[PDB]
Design an enzyme around this catalytic site. Structure first.
Site, PDB file in Angstrom:
ATOM      1  N   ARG A  52       0.803  -1.073  -0.195  1.00 57.24           N
ATOM      2  CA  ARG A  52      -0.047  -0.026  -0.027  1.00 57.24           C
ATOM      3  C   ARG A  52       0.898   1.123   0.068  1.00 57.24           C
ATOM      4  O   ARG A  52       0.407   2.247  -0.630  1.00 57.24           O
ATOM      5  CB  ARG A  52      -0.878  -0.012   1.205  1.00 57.24           C
ATOM      6  CG  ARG A  52      -1.851  -1.201   1.218  1.00 57.24           C
ATOM      7  CD  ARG A  52      -2.980  -0.990   0.199  1.00 57.24           C
ATOM      8  NE  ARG A  52      -2.599  -1.573  -1.083  1.00 57.24           N
ATOM      9  CZ  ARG A  52      -2.313  -2.894  -1.457  1.00 57.24           C
ATOM     10  NH1 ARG A  52      -2.214  -3.773  -0.392  1.00 57.24           N
ATOM     11  NH2 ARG A  52      -1.847  -3.296  -2.484  1.00 57.24           N
ATOM     12  N   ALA A  68     -16.597  12.600  -7.058  1.00 62.09           N
ATOM     13  CA  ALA A  68     -16.109  13.345  -6.275  1.00 62.09           C
ATOM     14  C   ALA A  68     -15.479  14.538  -6.832  1.00 62.09           C
ATOM     15  O   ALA A  68     -15.577  15.810  -6.406  1.00 62.09           O
ATOM     16  CB  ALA A  68     -15.137  12.796  -5.195  1.00 62.09           C
ATOM     17  N   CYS A 105      13.222   0.371  16.272  1.00 61.41           N
ATOM     18  CA  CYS A 105      13.051   1.701  16.429  1.00 61.41           C
ATOM     19  C   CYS A 105      14.484   2.780  16.981  1.00 61.41           C
ATOM     20  O   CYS A 105      15.359   1.530  17.065  1.00 61.41           O
ATOM     21  CB  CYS A 105      11.908   1.992  17.664  1.00 61.41           C
ATOM     22  SG  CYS A 105      12.906   1.910  19.228  1.00 61.41           S
ATOM     23  N   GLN A 148     -10.342   9.816   7.716  1.00 61.22           N
ATOM     24  CA  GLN A 148     -10.497   8.481   7.763  1.00 61.22           C
ATOM     25  C   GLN A 148      -9.286   7.792   6.747  1.00 61.22           C
ATOM     26  O   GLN A 148      -8.911   6.731   6.941  1.00 61.22           O
ATOM     27  CB  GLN A 148     -11.738   7.565   7.607  1.00 61.22           C
ATOM     28  CG  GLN A 148     -12.863   8.339   8.119  1.00 61.22           C
ATOM     29  CD  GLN A 148     -14.157   7.365   7.775  1.00 61.22           C
ATOM     30  OE1 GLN A 148     -15.161   8.203   7.649  1.00 61.22           O
ATOM     31  NE2 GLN A 148     -14.128   6.363   7.755  1.00 61.22           N
ATOM     32  N   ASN A 149      -8.878   8.543   5.943  1.00 63.17           N
ATOM     33  CA  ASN A 149      -7.844   8.073   4.977  1.00 63.17           C
ATOM     34  C   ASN A 149      -6.481   8.035   5.516  1.00 63.17           C
ATOM     35  O   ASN A 149      -5.998   8.820   6.387  1.00 63.17           O
ATOM     36  CB  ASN A 149      -7.972   8.653   3.753  1.00 63.17           C
ATOM     37  CG  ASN A 149      -9.429   8.970   3.214  1.00 63.17           C
ATOM     38  OD1 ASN A 149     -10.004   8.006   3.431  1.00 63.17           O
ATOM     39  ND2 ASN A 149      -9.470   9.972   2.376  1.00 63.17           N
ATOM     40  N   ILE A 150      -5.611   7.039   5.099  1.00 62.80           N
ATOM     41  CA  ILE A 150      -4.155   6.829   5.475  1.00 62.80           C
ATOM     42  C   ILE A 150      -3.371   7.477   4.470  1.00 62.80           C
ATOM     43  O   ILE A 150      -2.196   7.255   4.526  1.00 62.80           O
ATOM     44  CB  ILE A 150      -4.150   5.544   5.908  1.00 62.80           C
ATOM     45  CG1 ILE A 150      -4.289   4.230   4.638  1.00 62.80           C
ATOM     46  CG2 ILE A 150      -4.821   4.839   7.166  1.00 62.80           C
ATOM     47  CD1 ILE A 150      -3.922   2.871   4.956  1.00 62.80           C
ATOM     48  N   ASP A 151      -3.883   7.754   3.343  1.00 66.85           N
ATOM     49  CA  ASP A 151      -3.034   8.349   2.248  1.00 66.85           C
ATOM     50  C   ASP A 151      -2.669   9.849   2.492  1.00 66.85           C
ATOM     51  O   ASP A 151      -3.355  10.358   3.508  1.00 66.85           O
ATOM     52  CB  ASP A 151      -3.882   8.539   0.878  1.00 66.85           C
ATOM     53  CG  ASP A 151      -5.105   9.035   0.778  1.00 66.85           C
ATOM     54  OD1 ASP A 151      -4.761  10.368   1.030  1.00 66.85           O
ATOM     55  OD2 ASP A 151      -6.246   8.640   0.380  1.00 66.85           O
ATOM     56  N   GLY A 162     -17.279  11.137   0.807  1.00 68.64           N
ATOM     57  CA  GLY A 162     -16.598   9.858   0.373  1.00 68.64           C
ATOM     58  C   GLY A 162     -16.731   8.856   1.431  1.00 68.64           C
ATOM     59  O   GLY A 162     -16.110   7.834   1.566  1.00 68.64           O
ATOM     60  N   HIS A 208      -7.321   7.796  11.439  1.00 67.04           N
ATOM     61  CA  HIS A 208      -6.945   6.198  11.367  1.00 67.04           C
ATOM     62  C   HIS A 208      -5.369   6.119  11.137  1.00 67.04           C
ATOM     63  O   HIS A 208      -4.955   5.129  10.692  1.00 67.04           O
ATOM     64  CB  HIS A 208      -7.871   5.540  10.300  1.00 67.04           C
ATOM     65  CG  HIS A 208      -9.331   5.413  10.523  1.00 67.04           C
ATOM     66  ND1 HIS A 208     -10.244   5.371   9.758  1.00 67.04           N
ATOM     67  CD2 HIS A 208      -9.883   5.500  11.969  1.00 67.04           C
ATOM     68  CE1 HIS A 208     -11.669   5.175  10.361  1.00 67.04           C
ATOM     69  NE2 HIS A 208     -11.236   5.608  11.743  1.00 67.04           N
TER      70      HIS A 208
HETATM   71 ZN   LIG Z   1      11.253   2.844  20.631  1.00 69.32          ZN
END
Ligand SMILES: [Zn+2]
Lengths: 7, 235
Positions: free
Chosen positions: B56, B219, B135, B90-93, B175, B108
């Protein structure tokens, strides 16, 4: 509002 | 000028070439949502889930993927209203950001960020996440996960969103499917506090009948048309 959930 | 709260979902980015899950079959890129967007799924098959979000994330950054006129219209709306505008997605783009919107609340999460599974600290991240990726925020390095809210997890920025919902003069949902909560319940909350509610969508959402004003169609045509109408109303 609670957790992410469908329906 | 009125206070305007916009909520966007997957529909706005469909014309840009980004798909999402469908209630018709319950599939996201032909995957069951259980397998690629739950904490259990990640625990059961982390290799597959990381691979899914790697795909993705790569697809999001292909040159053929661009914000469309609906994204651009919302950037013009923010330009006009300044601090009296808030965009929740809500979009992760990252198409709202590429269009020029700022201070977007990604309820989200975001595909172009990862999170330390231990500290919760968030990193910008444009490449693959591999098992060797840990990390750099912890003495004992921990695995990285997508900074994406899964079903069963709490959305991000909820306190700020509910503040805006009680403040908005106009609430516009763009949307959205009406199937994903709590976002699908926001229109009810907005109405309770006296907001004028608007749905702009390719097709009616499940909660469409609760909106005072509704326009349907592509849209990239419907959203610029409504934003133009709204801006003209502002004189
Ligand atoms: Zn960490």
């Amino acid at each position: 509002g609670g957790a992410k959930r469908h329906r | 000028k009125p206070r305007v709260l916009v909520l966007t979902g997957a529909g706005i980015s469909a014309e840009s070439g980004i798909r999402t899950f469908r209630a018709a079959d319950g599939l996201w890129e032909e995957h069951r949502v259980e397998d690629v967007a739950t904490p259990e799924g990640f625990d059961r098959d982390p290799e597959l889930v990381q691979a899914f979000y790697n795909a993705r994330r790569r697809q999001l950054q292909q040159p053929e993927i661009q914000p469309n006129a609906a994204h651009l219209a919302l950037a013009k709306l923010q330009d006009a209203l300044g601090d009296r505008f808030l965009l929740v997605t809500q979009n992760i783009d990252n198409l709202h950001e590429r269009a020029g919107n700022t201070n977007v609340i990604h309820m989200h999460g975001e595909l172009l960020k990862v999170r330390c599974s231990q500290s919760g600290q968030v990193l910008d991240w444009t490449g693959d996440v591999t098992p060797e990726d840990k990390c750099h925020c912890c003495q004992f390095p921990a695995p990285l996960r997508p900074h994406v809210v899964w079903f069963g997890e709490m959305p991000l920025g909820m306190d700020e969103i509910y503040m805006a919902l009680s403040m908005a003069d106009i609430f516009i949902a763009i949307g959205t499917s009406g199937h994903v909560y709590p976002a699908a319940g926001f229109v009810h909350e907005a109405k309770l506090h006296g907001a004028h509610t608007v749905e702009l969508n390719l097709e009616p959402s499940q909660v469409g009948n609760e909106f005072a004003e509704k326009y349907y169609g592509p849209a990239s045509q419907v959203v610029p048309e409504f934003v133009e109408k709204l801006l003209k109303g502002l004189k």
